[PDB]
């Protein structure tokens, strides 16, 4: 299997906070650490393919966003991780392969990739966490 | 006194220009150097606290935005400074403590922190200036 | 000729893709490489001068955006050569990274960015052109 980068990069930002939470500036996604229970939604990643009627749509995470089997958001401190599962809201079939999440069937898919906490992680340190995904296509 | 970071970070960007001012791309805050008179408004910082009914809301400036006693926006050259005062528009009571601006009373405050020029600085070199504040809470 | 920086910096981003193009996150400008024919529009750059009734409006490109203007890949090798021209067809001049207006006045308008020479072999990637507002004097 091989990923060909071809499309834009979307960067999911999450701010983890304590119960008392102070939003400063533009609205962005924040969650308290008590909200980080297994399967809790973090946020959506919008996806739209064009010209892929005969290709398999895929997303590849940055190198520091996957440590095999698993995807995770990385802290700005380059240390703390928030493990997540990613899943299309339409329940179509996709596969995870070494940092690549690709759709099992060809077609110019459009949808939402939901990001959810993978295992309870209510001890996640407050800070700013990111997951970077780049669009492209997969082959075989 | 101790600040607990718990919330998002808002970055105020200011572009200082000459009289002939050429805005390129999307709207951002720009002011001519002649406009940097004592008390001149630079811009607002929106703040919204949640789950802090029993805590004191606070903002902490980045290390390079305060040189005790005083807050300032820092140039991208990391040299030039524009000193400012920050004050809530509702005139509520806050205290400054070594880079932290905290509310005197507990409660989930929402409001606007205005940034104002602290002393005439019409000789400010044209450039891009920033002040970064992070939401959290204080104690005592 | 001298450029005085005085105004904001606008950054034009272009994502070059293959035919099968996968957009992730919020809308941004993307073009397949087959779209990069000579004169193909890349995107506009809005410009608005104030207080320059007696000055010549100008834009200065970042050092890594002119040799000829070009967008530079995020990897820092690949270049997409372009020409910039105001949509209103007003008269401007290029001087070593500076694009300045031939007459004084607080011009407002759109600086169009167009492909300069066929470049359909442009590697996929993220390309940027950074322009800073200010004014020109001889």
Coordinates of C-alpha atoms in Angstrom, one line a residue:
Chain A
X1 CA 0.0 0.0 0.0
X2 CA 1.1 3.6 -0.9
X3 CA -0.2 7.1 0.0
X4 CA 0.0 9.9 -2.6
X5 CA -0.4 13.3 -1.1
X6 CA -2.9 15.3 -3.1
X7 CA -5.1 17.9 -1.4
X8 CA -5.1 20.3 1.5
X9 CA -3.9 19.8 5.1
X10 CA -6.4 20.4 7.9
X11 CA -5.2 20.9 11.5
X12 CA -7.5 20.0 14.4
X13 CA -6.7 22.1 17.5
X14 CA -7.9 21.1 21.0
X15 CA -7.3 23.0 24.2
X16 CA -7.5 20.8 27.3
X17 CA -8.5 22.8 30.5
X18 CA -9.6 22.3 34.1
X19 CA -13.3 22.7 35.1
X20 CA -12.8 26.5 35.4
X21 CA -12.2 27.4 31.8
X22 CA -11.3 30.9 30.4
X23 CA -11.8 31.4 26.7
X24 CA -9.6 34.2 25.3
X25 CA -10.1 35.6 21.8
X26 CA -11.6 33.8 18.8
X27 CA -13.8 30.8 19.5
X28 CA -11.9 27.5 19.3
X29 CA -12.4 23.9 20.5
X30 CA -11.8 23.3 24.2
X31 CA -12.7 20.5 26.6
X32 CA -12.2 20.0 30.3
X33 CA -10.1 17.0 31.2
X34 CA -13.1 15.4 32.8
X35 CA -14.8 15.4 29.4
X36 CA -12.0 13.1 28.0
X37 CA -13.8 9.9 28.7
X38 CA -13.5 6.9 26.3
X39 CA -15.4 7.7 23.0
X40 CA -16.0 11.4 23.8
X41 CA -16.2 13.5 20.6
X42 CA -13.4 16.0 20.1
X43 CA -14.5 17.6 16.8
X44 CA -15.1 17.0 13.1
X45 CA -12.7 17.1 10.2
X46 CA -14.6 18.1 7.0
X47 CA -13.5 16.2 3.9
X48 CA -14.3 16.7 0.2
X49 CA -12.8 14.8 -2.7
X50 CA -13.0 15.9 -6.3
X51 CA -11.6 14.0 -9.4
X52 CA -11.3 10.8 -7.4
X53 CA -14.1 8.8 -9.1
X54 CA -11.6 6.0 -9.7
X55 CA -9.2 6.5 -6.7
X56 CA -9.4 5.6 -3.0
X57 CA -9.6 8.8 -0.9
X58 CA -7.1 8.9 2.0
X59 CA -5.9 11.1 4.9
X60 CA -2.3 10.9 6.2
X61 CA -1.4 12.1 9.7
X62 CA 1.8 14.0 10.5
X63 CA 4.7 11.8 11.7
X64 CA 4.3 13.0 15.2
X65 CA 0.5 12.2 15.2
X66 CA 0.7 8.4 15.0
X67 CA 2.5 5.8 16.9
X68 CA 1.4 2.7 15.4
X69 CA -2.1 1.2 15.6
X70 CA -2.9 4.6 16.9
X71 CA -3.6 8.2 16.0
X72 CA -3.2 10.9 18.6
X73 CA -3.2 14.7 19.0
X74 CA 0.2 16.0 20.1
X75 CA 0.8 18.6 22.8
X76 CA 2.6 21.8 21.8
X77 CA 5.2 20.5 24.3
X78 CA 5.9 17.7 21.9
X79 CA 5.4 15.2 24.7
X80 CA 1.8 14.6 26.0
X81 CA -0.5 12.7 23.7
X82 CA -4.3 12.4 23.5
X83 CA -5.1 9.1 21.7
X84 CA -8.1 9.2 19.4
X85 CA -10.1 7.1 17.0
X86 CA -11.1 8.6 13.7
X87 CA -14.4 7.5 12.0
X88 CA -16.5 8.8 9.1
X89 CA -20.0 9.9 10.4
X90 CA -21.7 8.0 7.5
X91 CA -20.2 4.7 8.7
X92 CA -18.6 4.0 5.3
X93 CA -15.7 1.5 5.5
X94 CA -12.1 2.7 5.9
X95 CA -8.8 1.2 7.0
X96 CA -5.9 2.4 9.1
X97 CA -2.4 1.7 7.7
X98 CA 0.6 3.1 9.4
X99 CA -0.6 6.7 9.8
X100 CA -2.8 6.6 6.7
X101 CA -6.6 6.3 7.0
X102 CA -8.0 5.3 3.6
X103 CA -11.4 4.5 2.2
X104 CA -12.0 0.8 1.2
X105 CA -13.8 1.7 -2.1
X106 CA -13.0 4.2 -4.9
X107 CA -15.1 7.4 -5.3
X108 CA -15.1 11.2 -4.7
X109 CA -16.2 10.9 -1.1
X110 CA -17.4 13.9 0.9
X111 CA -18.2 13.7 4.6
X112 CA -17.1 14.3 8.2
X113 CA -14.3 12.5 9.9
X114 CA -15.2 12.6 13.6
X115 CA -12.3 12.5 16.1
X116 CA -13.2 10.6 19.4
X117 CA -11.1 9.9 22.6
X118 CA -9.6 6.4 22.4
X119 CA -9.6 5.1 26.0
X120 CA -10.3 7.3 29.1
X121 CA -7.8 10.0 29.4
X122 CA -9.2 12.4 32.1
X123 CA -5.7 12.8 33.4
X124 CA -4.6 14.6 30.2
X125 CA -2.5 17.7 31.2
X126 CA -4.1 21.1 30.3
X127 CA -2.5 22.5 27.2
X128 CA -2.9 22.8 23.4
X129 CA -3.0 19.7 21.3
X130 CA -3.1 19.2 17.5
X131 CA -3.8 16.5 14.9
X132 CA -2.7 17.3 11.3
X133 CA -4.2 15.4 8.4
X134 CA -3.3 15.8 4.7
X135 CA -5.6 14.6 2.0
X136 CA -4.5 12.3 -0.9
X137 CA -5.3 8.9 -2.3
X138 CA -4.2 5.3 -1.6
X139 CA -3.0 2.5 -3.8
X140 CA -3.3 -0.6 -4.2
Chain B
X1 CA -0.3 34.1 44.4
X2 CA -0.4 31.5 41.7
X3 CA -1.8 31.3 38.1
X4 CA -3.3 28.0 36.8
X5 CA -3.4 28.0 33.0
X6 CA -6.9 26.7 32.0
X7 CA -8.4 28.1 28.8
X8 CA -7.4 29.3 25.4
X9 CA -4.7 31.7 24.3
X10 CA -5.7 34.9 22.4
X11 CA -3.0 36.8 20.3
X12 CA -3.5 40.5 19.7
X13 CA -1.7 41.6 16.5
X14 CA -1.1 45.3 15.7
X15 CA 0.5 46.7 12.6
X16 CA 2.1 50.1 13.2
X17 CA 2.4 52.1 10.0
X18 CA 3.3 55.6 8.6
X19 CA 0.5 58.0 7.5
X20 CA 0.3 56.4 4.1
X21 CA -1.0 52.9 5.0
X22 CA -1.3 50.0 2.5
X23 CA -3.6 47.2 3.8
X24 CA -2.9 43.9 2.0
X25 CA -5.1 40.9 2.4
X26 CA -7.7 40.4 5.1
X27 CA -8.6 43.0 7.6
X28 CA -6.4 43.3 10.7
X29 CA -5.7 46.0 13.2
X30 CA -3.4 48.7 12.0
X31 CA -2.6 52.1 13.5
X32 CA -0.4 54.9 12.2
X33 CA 2.4 55.8 14.7
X34 CA 0.8 59.3 15.0
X35 CA -2.2 57.5 16.5
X36 CA -0.2 56.0 19.4
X37 CA -1.0 58.8 21.9
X38 CA -1.4 58.1 25.7
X39 CA -4.6 56.1 26.3
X40 CA -5.3 55.5 22.6
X41 CA -7.3 52.2 22.1
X42 CA -5.4 49.4 20.4
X43 CA -8.1 46.8 20.5
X44 CA -10.3 44.5 22.4
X45 CA -9.7 41.0 23.8
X46 CA -12.9 39.1 24.3
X47 CA -13.0 36.9 27.3
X48 CA -15.6 34.3 28.4
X49 CA -15.2 32.1 31.5
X50 CA -17.2 28.9 32.2
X51 CA -17.3 26.7 35.3
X52 CA -15.5 29.4 37.4
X53 CA -18.4 30.3 39.8
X54 CA -16.0 29.8 42.7
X55 CA -12.6 30.9 41.1
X56 CA -11.0 34.1 40.1
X57 CA -10.7 34.5 36.4
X58 CA -7.2 35.5 35.1
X59 CA -5.1 36.1 32.0
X60 CA -1.3 35.5 31.9
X61 CA 0.8 37.3 29.3
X62 CA 3.6 35.6 27.5
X63 CA 7.0 36.0 29.1
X64 CA 8.1 38.5 26.4
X65 CA 5.0 40.7 26.8
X66 CA 5.7 41.9 30.4
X67 CA 8.8 43.4 32.1
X68 CA 7.3 43.9 35.5
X69 CA 5.0 46.5 36.4
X70 CA 4.3 46.8 32.7
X71 CA 2.6 44.9 29.9
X72 CA 3.7 45.6 26.2
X73 CA 3.2 44.2 22.7
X74 CA 6.5 42.9 21.3
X75 CA 7.7 43.6 17.8
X76 CA 8.4 40.6 15.5
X77 CA 12.1 41.8 15.7
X78 CA 11.8 40.9 19.3
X79 CA 13.3 44.3 20.1
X80 CA 10.7 47.1 19.9
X81 CA 8.0 47.3 22.5
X82 CA 4.7 49.2 22.8
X83 CA 3.7 49.6 26.4
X84 CA 0.0 49.2 27.1
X85 CA -2.5 49.2 29.9
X86 CA -5.3 46.6 29.8
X87 CA -8.6 47.3 31.5
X88 CA -12.1 45.6 31.4
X89 CA -14.7 47.7 29.6
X90 CA -17.2 47.0 32.5
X91 CA -14.8 48.8 34.9
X92 CA -14.7 45.7 37.2
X93 CA -11.8 45.4 39.7
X94 CA -8.7 43.5 38.6
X95 CA -5.1 43.3 39.9
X96 CA -1.8 42.9 38.0
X97 CA 0.7 40.5 39.4
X98 CA 4.0 39.7 37.5
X99 CA 2.4 39.1 34.1
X100 CA -1.0 38.0 35.4
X101 CA -4.1 40.2 35.3
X102 CA -6.7 38.6 37.6
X103 CA -10.2 39.5 38.8
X104 CA -10.6 40.6 42.4
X105 CA -13.8 38.6 42.8
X106 CA -14.7 35.0 42.0
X107 CA -17.2 34.3 39.2
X108 CA -17.6 33.3 35.6
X109 CA -16.9 36.7 34.1
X110 CA -17.6 37.5 30.5
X111 CA -16.4 40.8 29.0
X112 CA -13.9 42.7 27.0
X113 CA -10.4 43.5 28.0
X114 CA -9.5 46.7 26.2
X115 CA -5.8 47.3 25.3
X116 CA -4.7 51.0 25.5
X117 CA -1.4 52.8 24.8
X118 CA 0.4 53.5 28.1
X119 CA 2.3 56.8 27.5
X120 CA 2.9 58.6 24.2
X121 CA 4.7 56.3 21.8
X122 CA 4.3 58.1 18.5
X123 CA 7.9 57.2 17.6
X124 CA 7.1 53.5 17.6
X125 CA 8.9 51.9 14.6
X126 CA 6.5 50.6 11.9
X127 CA 6.3 46.8 12.2
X128 CA 4.1 44.0 13.5
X129 CA 3.5 43.9 17.2
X130 CA 1.9 41.2 19.4
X131 CA 0.5 40.6 22.9
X132 CA -0.4 37.0 23.8
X133 CA -2.7 36.3 26.8
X134 CA -3.7 32.9 28.1
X135 CA -6.8 32.2 30.1
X136 CA -6.7 30.6 33.6
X137 CA -7.5 31.3 37.2
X138 CA -5.8 32.8 40.2
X139 CA -5.2 32.0 43.9
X140 CA -5.0 33.1 46.7
Chain C
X1 CA 14.0 53.8 -6.0
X2 CA 13.2 53.0 -2.4
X3 CA 10.4 51.0 -0.7
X4 CA 9.1 52.1 2.6
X5 CA 7.2 49.3 4.5
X6 CA 3.9 50.8 5.7
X7 CA 0.9 48.6 6.0
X8 CA 0.0 45.0 6.4
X9 CA 1.3 41.7 5.1
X10 CA -1.0 39.4 3.1
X11 CA 0.0 35.8 2.4
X12 CA -1.4 34.0 -0.6
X13 CA -1.6 30.2 -0.2
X14 CA -2.0 27.8 -3.1
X15 CA -2.2 24.0 -2.8
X16 CA -1.1 22.2 -6.0
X17 CA -2.6 18.7 -6.3
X18 CA -3.0 15.8 -8.8
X19 CA -6.3 15.3 -10.6
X20 CA -7.8 13.4 -7.6
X21 CA -7.9 16.2 -5.1
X22 CA -8.8 15.7 -1.4
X23 CA -9.8 18.9 0.5
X24 CA -9.4 18.6 4.3
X25 CA -10.6 21.3 6.7
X26 CA -11.7 24.7 5.7
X27 CA -11.8 26.0 2.2
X28 CA -8.6 27.2 0.7
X29 CA -7.3 27.7 -2.9
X30 CA -6.2 24.5 -4.6
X31 CA -5.4 23.8 -8.3
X32 CA -4.5 20.6 -10.0
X33 CA -1.1 20.8 -11.8
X34 CA -2.9 20.4 -15.1
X35 CA -4.5 23.8 -14.3
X36 CA -1.1 25.6 -14.2
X37 CA -1.1 26.7 -17.9
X38 CA 0.4 30.0 -18.8
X39 CA -1.8 32.9 -17.6
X40 CA -4.0 30.7 -15.5
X41 CA -5.5 32.7 -12.5
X42 CA -4.2 31.6 -9.1
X43 CA -6.0 34.1 -6.9
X44 CA -6.6 37.7 -6.0
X45 CA -4.9 39.8 -3.3
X46 CA -7.1 42.6 -2.0
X47 CA -5.3 46.0 -1.5
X48 CA -6.6 49.2 0.1
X49 CA -4.4 52.2 0.7
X50 CA -5.3 55.1 3.1
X51 CA -3.5 58.4 3.5
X52 CA -1.4 58.0 0.4
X53 CA -3.0 60.8 -1.7
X54 CA 0.5 62.1 -2.2
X55 CA 2.4 58.7 -2.4
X56 CA 2.9 55.9 -4.7
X57 CA 1.3 52.7 -3.4
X58 CA 3.5 49.6 -3.5
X59 CA 3.8 46.0 -2.5
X60 CA 7.0 44.2 -1.5
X61 CA 7.4 40.4 -1.9
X62 CA 9.3 38.4 0.6
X63 CA 12.9 37.6 -0.3
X64 CA 12.0 34.1 -1.1
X65 CA 9.2 35.2 -3.5
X66 CA 11.3 37.0 -6.2
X67 CA 14.4 36.4 -8.3
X68 CA 10.2 37.4 -11.6
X69 CA 7.8 36.8 -8.8
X70 CA 7.0 33.3 -7.6
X71 CA 5.2 31.3 -4.9
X72 CA 7.6 29.1 -2.9
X73 CA 6.7 25.6 -1.8
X74 CA 6.6 24.7 2.0
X75 CA 9.5 22.4 1.2
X76 CA 11.8 25.2 0.1
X77 CA 12.8 24.4 -3.4
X78 CA 9.8 24.3 -5.8
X79 CA 8.7 27.6 -7.3
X80 CA 5.6 28.6 -9.2
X81 CA 6.5 31.6 -11.3
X82 CA 3.7 34.2 -11.6
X83 CA 2.9 37.6 -12.9
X84 CA 0.9 40.0 -10.8
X85 CA -1.4 42.6 -12.4
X86 CA -4.2 44.9 -11.0
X87 CA -7.6 44.0 -12.3
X88 CA -8.4 47.6 -13.1
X89 CA -5.5 47.7 -15.6
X90 CA -3.8 50.7 -13.8
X91 CA -0.1 51.2 -14.6
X92 CA 2.4 49.6 -12.3
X93 CA 6.1 48.8 -12.4
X94 CA 8.3 46.0 -11.0
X95 CA 11.6 46.9 -9.3
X96 CA 13.5 44.1 -7.7
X97 CA 10.7 42.5 -5.5
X98 CA 8.7 45.7 -5.4
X99 CA 5.5 46.2 -7.4
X100 CA 4.6 49.9 -7.3
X101 CA 1.9 52.1 -8.8
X102 CA 3.1 54.6 -11.5
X103 CA 1.1 57.5 -10.1
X104 CA 0.3 58.8 -6.6
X105 CA -3.0 58.1 -4.9
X106 CA -4.8 56.0 -2.3
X107 CA -5.5 53.1 -4.7
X108 CA -7.9 50.3 -3.7
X109 CA -8.2 47.2 -5.9
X110 CA -7.4 43.6 -6.6
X111 CA -4.0 42.3 -7.5
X112 CA -4.5 39.2 -9.6
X113 CA -1.9 36.5 -9.5
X114 CA -1.5 34.6 -12.8
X115 CA 0.8 31.6 -13.8
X116 CA 3.8 33.0 -15.8
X117 CA 4.7 30.3 -18.3
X118 CA 3.3 26.8 -18.4
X119 CA 4.1 24.9 -15.2
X120 CA 1.9 21.8 -15.3
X121 CA 4.8 19.9 -14.0
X122 CA 4.7 21.7 -10.6
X123 CA 5.1 19.2 -7.9
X124 CA 2.1 18.8 -5.6
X125 CA 2.6 20.8 -2.4
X126 CA 1.7 24.0 -0.6
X127 CA 2.9 27.2 -2.1
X128 CA 2.9 30.8 -0.7
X129 CA 3.4 34.3 -1.9
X130 CA 3.9 37.0 0.8
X131 CA 3.3 40.7 0.0
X132 CA 3.9 43.6 2.3
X133 CA 2.2 47.0 1.8
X134 CA 4.1 50.3 1.8
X135 CA 5.1 53.1 -0.6
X136 CA 7.7 53.8 -3.3
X137 CA 10.0 56.7 -3.9
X138 CA 12.8 57.3 -6.5

